[PDB]
Amino acid sequence: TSRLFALIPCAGTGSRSGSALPKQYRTLAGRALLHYTLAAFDACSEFAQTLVVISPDDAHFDARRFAGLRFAVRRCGGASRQASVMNGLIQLAEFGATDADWVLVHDAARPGITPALIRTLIGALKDDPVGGIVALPVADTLKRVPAGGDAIERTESRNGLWQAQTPQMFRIGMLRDAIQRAQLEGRDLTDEASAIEWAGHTPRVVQGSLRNFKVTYPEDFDLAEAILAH
Numbered sequence: 627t628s629r630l631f632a633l634i635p636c637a638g639t640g641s642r643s644g645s646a647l648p649k650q651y652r653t654l655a656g657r658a659l660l661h662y663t664l665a666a667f668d669a670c671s672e673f674a675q676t677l678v679v680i681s682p683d684d685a686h687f688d689a690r691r692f693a694g695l696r697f698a699v700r701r702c703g704g705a706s707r708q709a710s711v712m713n714g715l716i717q718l719a720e721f722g723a724t725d726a727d728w729v730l731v732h733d734a735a736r737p738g739i740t741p742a743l744i745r746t747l748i749g750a751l752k753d754d755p756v757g758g759i760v761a762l763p764v765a766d767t768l769k770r771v772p773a774g775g776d777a778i779e780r781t782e783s784r785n786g787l788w789q790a791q792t793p794q795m796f797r798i799g800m801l802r803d804a805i806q807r808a809q810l811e812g813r814d815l816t817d818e819a820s821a822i823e824w825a826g827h828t829p830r831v832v833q834g835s836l837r838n839f840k841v842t843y844p845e846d847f848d849l850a851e852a853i854l855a856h
């Protein structure tokens with residue numbers, strides 16, 4: 627009976643992407659970056675609603691560029707990603723969400739997300755007491771490079787290491803309280819799983835895809851444009 631809610635943190639600036647316009651609004655193959663994320667969730671009718679969190683100062687979001695897609699947008703963006711997620715989780719109650727419902731937090735900067743991968747995550751963790759994330763095992767040899775230079779100090783082990791992606795699937799009640807705990811202890815975490823972990827819970831990993839990579843630096847735009855439109 628647990629309903630499915632989607633939460634798209636979209637209140638970032640994309641400072642590493644070198645784009646003056648927020649990278650989530652950057653046009654790829656004649657289409658906005660965010661549009662690919664929303665279209666993927668829109669294809670999944672089993673979702674109750676998709677909430678997009680944008681900054682209160684966002685003057686670039688144009689709803690007309692996303693017409694036909696089923697989603698809602700709220701200007702409850704925070705100073706950080708975790709804050710934007712926290713405000714979003716609170717905001718979900720407006721749409722009838724409860725603490726027992728699932729929430730799937732997905733980066734807008736990951737346009738390669740597909741309905742198949744969404745439903746793979748859901749189907750694998752729907753009966754899980756905690757939930758989990760989509761992720762990718764570290765395939766490359768890890769090198770330690772001291773900050774400030776390009777010199778390699780030594781080789782680090784990659785055994786048992788995964789690179790976390792999104793969506794990150796957890797219960798609204800457990801996730802909100804976890805982040806609330808993290809903020810109460812002065813911790814700003816990188817993803818939702820981290821809060822779940824520090825709260826004392828054990829999240830799961832589901833095999834992700836390199837197609838689901840996040841656009842982060844100027845190379846990624848043309849690369850995603852190659853990955854997309856295919």
Ligand SMILES: Nc1ccn([C@@H]2O[C@H](COP(=O)(O)OP(=O)(O)OP(=O)(O)O)[C@@H](O)[C@H]2O)c(=O)n1
Nearest residue numbers: 635636637638639640641642705706707734735
């Ligand atoms: N204060 C913030 C910061 C990030 N995000 C969202 O979190 C997702 C992934 O975070 P990231 O890749 O780091 O995007 P940015 O923070 O905007 O870029 P940068 O880290 O280079 O500044 C993005 O969809 C971004 O919009 C958000 O909603 N509110």
Ligand SMILES: [Mg+2]
Nearest residue numbers: 638639640707
């Ligand atoms: Mg960031």
